[model samples]
Target chain A: LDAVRKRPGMYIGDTDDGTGLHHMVFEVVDNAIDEALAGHCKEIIVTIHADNSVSVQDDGRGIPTGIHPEEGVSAAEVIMTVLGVGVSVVNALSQKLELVIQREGKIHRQIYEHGVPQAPLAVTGETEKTGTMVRFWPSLETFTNVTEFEYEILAKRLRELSFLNSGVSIRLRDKRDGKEDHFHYEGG
Target chain B: LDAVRKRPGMYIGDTDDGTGLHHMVFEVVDNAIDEALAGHCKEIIVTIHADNSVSVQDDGRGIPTGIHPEEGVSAAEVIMTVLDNSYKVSGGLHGVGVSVVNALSQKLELVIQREGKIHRQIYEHGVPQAPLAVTGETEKTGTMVRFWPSLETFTNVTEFEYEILAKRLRELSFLNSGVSIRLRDKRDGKEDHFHY
Candidate 1:
């Protein structure tokens, strides 16, 4: 993975651009989808907010609520720490870093400073059914020139995902002060 | 090329019992190589000898003459004809034709049957002074090409690679199925039998 970061262009085709940021979001979302594929989850939601923040949510069995045999920590803490670091790297390279995992009737939040974890994993005494939500703000230093996201492009990609996995629902919403648009797919 | 028919597989790539008969000799040698590129002459040879014979020769200027023509016909023919014919449907389907053997030939001889009453001209390389002669009593004949390819042209070196030749011939046989073909070869001072 370190080698991949050093030469990300060779694998992902680009490193210093919009595609690189999109790749980070995809990697995190794909991990959640993998959990869904394992039957521990259902319904994953990805949100690209107008503030350049992104989030992914899934409705599934909460992450294991026990101590990690290897890391000697809670399973949820391990997921938050690892995903927090990963998302931080993405933020440093782009402009977003905020991930919130909602599971086991509680919400876990981890913040990042320029793609580096700035805060330890904390449980916000909020109540949720059973699932995870990750929100992040891309790093402005890496995404210095990018100011907008193409909704049409995102819509096309989500539509392709719906085509590939026939039973997933994907929705896109833009909440800019005056302009708003919505895209939803329920078939797959 | 009279010599090509004697061993059609050497040039056209095959002389099998199937469509190879039609493919291994005439269609490629005449329409593709000789007529197309060399343009040594307009007449092409397709003869089936007494012993189930098959032979094809052309009166084109031979292979690549390299001589600059005022009309650019020579170079144009070589360039356009060598391109994969799949993109040029007017020729044939399987574009894997002439250039394959030309690239692999160890020895290639071109006999130019000039239009005048003078003797027929032959060239080794595009030169005019290799071997000159009048083949028959006719002076209107175009060019006659004969080549003796080396064993390196095929996958197996020891024996004559008839299977590869048959495959190429089958492709040609399908493309130009109506033409008659003849196949024969001499290797190691003995006549080897080949059938598709």
Candidate 2:
């Protein structure tokens, strides 16, 4: 975690500018795309919240909630909370990151800050849909003070990913200005 | 191990087609690129043996030989033999590249030169054959991995395309300007060097 904070560029591409900031979005979204590739998912949503936090939601086989056979933690925790993967990488760069996972007709939520676990994994409510939602407030500690993001940049990358995956549909929304963009590709 | 052999596409995208064949090459090259990204590598070599075995070598900080403080295993062992940290950065849609290569491989050889000593290890069907050992010494620092992709996983995969590999090697050359790559086909005594 220290290395991630000290040398943010190593995990991400650059410092907290447009390129670096967008890379965090990519890290979270890539895992969702993987779920899609495995033929288990279809829709994904990327949003810039009014509080300047980023949230990505995917209606996939909500990351397994059962205890990992080897790691002994809920597979959702390892996949969502461990720094070894994408969403966890974003966890270390955000002031507050919340992971809401819907599986087995229940919505399980957990809170984290700078990769540190802030609370126990909790069941917030019940939902018929199975999916994963991650919300993170970009931390200035890792990104620079003036690392303002451009919605167009985020939209452009999401569009490219839609084309690459072919069947996955993605939507990006900016709550600060009430603008939104959609990307989806059905076939080659 | 059996899972990879039974469902090869799940690991490398496809079983033995162009995409899967190219993925074998990518699994090796991405590690070297990561080394280049760390600012320690300048050149990498990819070779295809006459018997259909493949190898990748790099002039960079070799896979760490010192024992990992957390895992109690040598860093080289961690990177080559384990699936945990190796997949932190996914090469494509999946995080099972190198380990996938090791899993579907009949044999895999690891030779790393670091801290003034040349270390060596071996794996068969993704399982380690022995402990990491210091075989010799080298003034240079780097890593070399050789493996023969298994026939069990890829039934009747014969063609090894040099042209396909050259394009990808050249693409990486352009992606990282400082890293030069050389692709050689031992079957025909042909070689292509990619440098931007």
Candidate 3:
């Protein structure tokens, strides 16, 4: 219902600080980790850049690119149609996002600006593995008083995600501060 | 739906020291001065006790205590109603202002001299622990609110100040012109009186 657009707090919560900015990464990681839980998922990578761009990649079964019965768009495109229902919360909250997908040994790419899909999914090349890599420029305009991402906040959360995924290793790197961490657990 | 209790930043912006706690006092004072804005809100007395309980007494039209239409209870009882903001979205975490003070307070005593009778009630964390009842007889018409801010939620704020409060009290007198605000520090027996 465009709830995220209307009231930014409906999704990322309080914008008093850098909370919503941090929440954006957490939501994206959560979806990527869900892909890992499916067993088809293998690994995940998150990179935060000095230019305010964040890239999260999951080596999991990519979102289906074929048309659906109800909506004409691919499953990956459908993900951004609704608000607070799925990853669209993060998608819409971003100022610009570039999406790359590898499925059926074919590479596909799409870009979004402020929740609007910029262009149709483009077939780029062929790849051996199926996965998704999404890079987003978080919208400072969406939330109040948030200009930068806190490294410790993301590290603490990413550490928790790894503990959950024993079968897979999650890689988190911050290019902004040159800090790196590996998170993995055998089991609880 | 309990926004003030959930995320208080929406109300106070950011809680570094005791700004939000102090903002709570301003909200209550504004509500009392609302009575003055209309006509006569003569006096407001505030107490800064060593117990950390800040009490505000006002000689203004007290909180209404009649059968509320939607509530099926008195509006006096509804001021601290858990029933008030249930229908609102949880995203509005600021809630209402003075109600936030109650949500963040521990021992809150509300004494209202209204309609030829005096009613007293107490609240903690915005909930009515004691129902509205006639505490005693008083010819005056006003409201007295005594509150001790909860030490649980407020982290950075340690001590509540008297000079800072007196400064604001003096400002209110300058702005209002006709009103008199007297601040009594029960700890040191010092009174900062304001009139304009």
Candidate 4:
């Protein structure tokens, strides 16, 4: 966990450059894109909040919420805290995190502050649809120079992802100025 | 520990195209060059054995043989095993070059001559076979490192090109003028000695 915070470049990109900040957002969105690749997800919505916090929501089989046999915590928590490449690193570099998962006829939510889970995964409500939403604020301390996420960069990536994974609708929305783009290619 | 083995390109360079293989050689060579920068080393010899292993010997103040305060191992052993910087003025990029080289190599042999004593340690895939042992008494003070690039890591490339090494050593000699650097290939008896 500290390893990522200490050497973010090795995990992401150059901290001083905007590459690191953009790469950080891509890492979180990548999970949703991965779900689409498996044919279980159809839409991925990415929002750049007015405050610079970004949110990636997908309609797919939500992340497994069972307990990890080795770590004795919910598989979702283990994935965010212990895993390295995927969402775990994004959580480590983010100042705060809000994870929302709707699966198995129930809605689950968890909060993480600087990669550490504040508490156990709590069942918030019930749901008939299965999907996941992860919203995070990139840490100013870790990013140092570049913290603002550019809409054009995210749109470029989402457009490419939609092209690569045909039939997956990827949307990029910026709340700062109401700028948005929809990427959906039904061409197989 | 296994991360470098899995993704060597991130740490060094492309595993294919001979870039990573050549970069491995320079990581070891850079330490001796650092000694030259510090004014303790004058002559450096790089020999490519017939089997493709390399031995870089430098007549400089050898690496410290004292114990690492935290690791409880010889400083030389710790340097090769752990990720730590030993030099004050180093050309090291990530400060993980020497250890990364050892990890990626199939085998490494380290010899240090310091304070009237000669010490040696052997490692296989970066794991030390045994602790640093006093080999013999010596009036010489220098360090010698020999390593075989791992065929497992550099699968398509094993033989190091003579010209590729000569080019770098030639540039180094010119950069650090007055230091004698030699490159000899035992495979075909080709040699290039630069004393710019």
Candidate 5:
């Protein structure tokens, strides 16, 4: 954590520009895409909120909510807190982050303020659905220069991802301007 | 070394054609061009011997000949053996490139002029013949690498075309835009030079 905060550019890239800020979104989306590749996910929804925060929701077999045998914490929390490359980096670079998981008839949620967990993973409600949602606000301290996420950059990559993944559906919505692009391709 | 030897194409390029054979030459030259980019080199000399073996020599700040701090071997040996870093303004081939070239060659040798002394080492199929030794003292500083491509790997085409090499040297010399590159063919009395 200390090293990532000290040299955020190495984990992400060019933190002051829009590149790293958007890379944070991609890293989380990549995990969902990986789930898609593994035949467990089919849909991904990406939203750019009014506050410039972003959320990626995926209809995948949610990250296991059971206790991690080694870490003695919920596996979902362990993944967000210590997993090296993917969502952990997203957690570290964002000023605020929320992880919500629907799995095994329960809704699990955790919140972090600047990468420090506000509390342990807890059940917020019951659910029959199974999926994951990660919402994050790029840290102003890290992204000092570029604050707003560009729609074109995100759309271009998402469209490419949808084309590559064949049947998986990726929807991008910008609530700031009520703009949207739905990306889906059958002949990957 | 075994992996590169087994799947030689993965490291260099297509093995059964002239592409990989020529890429071997570029990997070595790219090191010298990296030195040129760092403003440590001014001239490069490329030679195609009658046997199809090639040699690339550069008048750059030669590779450091001292013992590496971590590996307990000469820095040059580490550069030749490890997939690592020694150049800052790199254009091609990281630390692994030279070693990959070494692994793919039947024989490779180094002649480095640095630190007021001449340093030399020889490798056969990527294994060092001996520790780097100071053969003599010299005032100039640079690196010269001579190699014979392994016929076992470059099975179909082993002979190099003079025009192919000359074209690349011309392009490289123009790209660097001041470092003089001299291309010579001992098989024929043909030569070309570029500086701008």
Candidate 6:
């Protein structure tokens, strides 16, 4: 953590630019990669909402429900707390809006505020399939100069991922009226 | 030159180790990269023979034959002379090596040495900065650079690694296979040899 504070740019590339947003996307993708590595996930869906919010969904076993021995907390709570803190630091560095992660399922219903434990992982009792969802709104204060996200740049970057990891399928949907595109890869 | 002579190990990575062998390879590879950029050459070959002697050959238009406007000498001669005397200084601060090796080596050999006419010269240290000599004529027309580093300058008996060299050569080959490299180590009892 101290190292990250000292060399934030080294980890995130650039703190004072749009590269921070890309870093956020990368962080979520890293979690997806971790899931894939554990054989719990296969596909990752990334969406750029009409209101400029971003959402990522994975069809994985979802965040673990078991308790963490070290933290004495649910695995889902640990995941949210860590991710929230990461988002907070990124927000502080880039002066952007904070991010939140919401897990909706019968066994786990929790919301993380900027990587903090907003609520402990609790059973919702609503029986549905398991998955994790992350939605973030970039703070306007951090993105003062930029008016809107460039869909083409994001689309191109996602398309390159198709070439990078052959087996992994990544789908991007822009839900802004007629501004949407999809990306899929199966060349593992 | 003075700075590099003072701190030889910093830029070359090591003053007393086999890492210095890489200095020679990098110099020639960079030249090949330049030739590739110029569109004149596509292949470069480097050979380190059995007697701990190093040689590099390039398919590039044999080191520009015309006279230099400022030096009034053939470009080939200028290159050889600079390589023999200036390699050490060029590489010291900037991590560039061609001339520094020539300057520092105990016996620096340049051979465009072939069949009928062989152009060769040997330099000791930076002092005996010899003029290019033609021993015989050659049937082939390509540059052949050969040199033996001074034993005194190196503290340890060094040898090159085949896997390490192969990985680097493979990258170069992939970038421009038209330029191939062959490295041979003839250091009597040393084990690993032959990197394609």
Report how far residue A4 has shifted in candidate 2, in Å: 36
* Residue B190 error, candidate 1, Å: 99
Error of 4 at B70 (Å): 0.8
Off by over 4 Å in 2: A1-188, B1-6, B38-41, B84-94
- Chain B TM-scores across candidates: 0.41, 0.87, 0.85, 0.92, 0.91, 0.68
Q: What lDDT tens digits, residue by residue, belong to model 5 across residues B23-102?
A: 88988888877655544558888899988789998888888889999988899988887655643232355544788898
Docking class of 6: incorrect
Best model per lDDT: 4
Residue A62 miss distance in model 2 (angstroms): 33
Mind giving the per-residue lDDT tens digits that candidate 1 earns over B1-196? 2123123355444434333333423334544332533342333343333333233465544334344466333432343224243433213335445443333333444444444423333221121232344454544444444433333323333233445444444444444434332333433222222122
Which docking band does candidate 3 fall into?
incorrect
The DockQ of predicted model 3 stands at 0.02
**lDDT by residue for model 6 over B15-102, one digit each (tens)?**
5667766665566556644443333344455566676666666544445645689866556556644525534211222345456665
Residue-level error in angstroms, candidate 3, position B19: 54
Q: Compared with the true structure, what per-residue lDDT tens digits does model 1 show for residues A1-188?
A: 22222233454334455676576667656655655554433567776787867676766565564678996656654554442234324543443356565666777666644333444567887774666666766544334354456666665766677666645555555555433333334462
TM-score of chain A of each: 0.70, 0.89, 0.92, 0.95, 0.94, 0.72
Q: What is the TM-score of chain A in candidate 5?
A: 0.94
What is candidate 5's DockQ? Answer: 0.01
Of the two candidates 2 and 6, the one with more favorable TM-score, higher being better, is 2
The lDDT values for all models are 0.45, 0.75, 0.73, 0.82, 0.81, 0.54
Please write out the lDDT profile of model 4 over residues A71-98, one tens digit for every residue.
7889998888875267898888887899
Model 3 / residue B171 / CA error / Å: 63
Question: Each candidate: how many clashes?
Answer: 30, 0, 1, 0, 0, 24
lDDT of 6: 0.54
- Stretches of candidate 5 off by over 4 Å are A1-188, B37-41, B84-91, B94-96
